[PDB]
Design a protein around this ligand. Structure first.
Ligand SMILES: [Mg+2]
Ligand SMILES: [Mg+2]
Length: 58
RNA sequence: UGUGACCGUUAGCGCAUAGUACAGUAAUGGAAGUGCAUAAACCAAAUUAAAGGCUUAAAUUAAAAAUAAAAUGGCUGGUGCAAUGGCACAAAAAAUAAGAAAGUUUAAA
């Protein structure tokens, strides 16, 4: 019936999570170290984190 | 002062100040310690999955926007980025030598 209908996100094994998110963690450190917390890039990251936390409540 | 296919907090000086704290009767020996951010070991919590019958022929839409889990809570301080700290010599300056012994030299207009 199509990709959109049957698409699913795989679950990362607990032991492999430090490798799946290595790049994202580095970027956040890169932004805060160079641009600071009062930056447009920093605000975007925080907004994305709010979305993740809100979805934990199910 | 100048330069670097020299280092970037387990590195580079022992020291991003400290020959301090501390050990020793003494001579002496001699640390740890920058700023920011979901790394690892590590301890607690999280098992499972069910559903069986409204009668169908003239809607809506300025425009645009707006429905979906990659990630538990902690303790710890690795990695990534930056330098009011170090390393090596170079340039300039400084230091340095006289034969004689109570004696004369070396001064550019
Ligand atoms: Mg560090
Ligand atoms: Mg050191």
């Amino acid at each position: 019936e199509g990709y959109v209908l049957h698409e699913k996100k795989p679950v990362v094994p607990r032991a492999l999570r430090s490798f799946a998110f290595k790049s994202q963690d580095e970027h956040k450190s890169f932004v805060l170290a160079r641009l600071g917390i009062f930056s447009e890039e920093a605000k975007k990251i925080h907004l994305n984190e709010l979305r993740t936390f809100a979805k934990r409540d199910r």
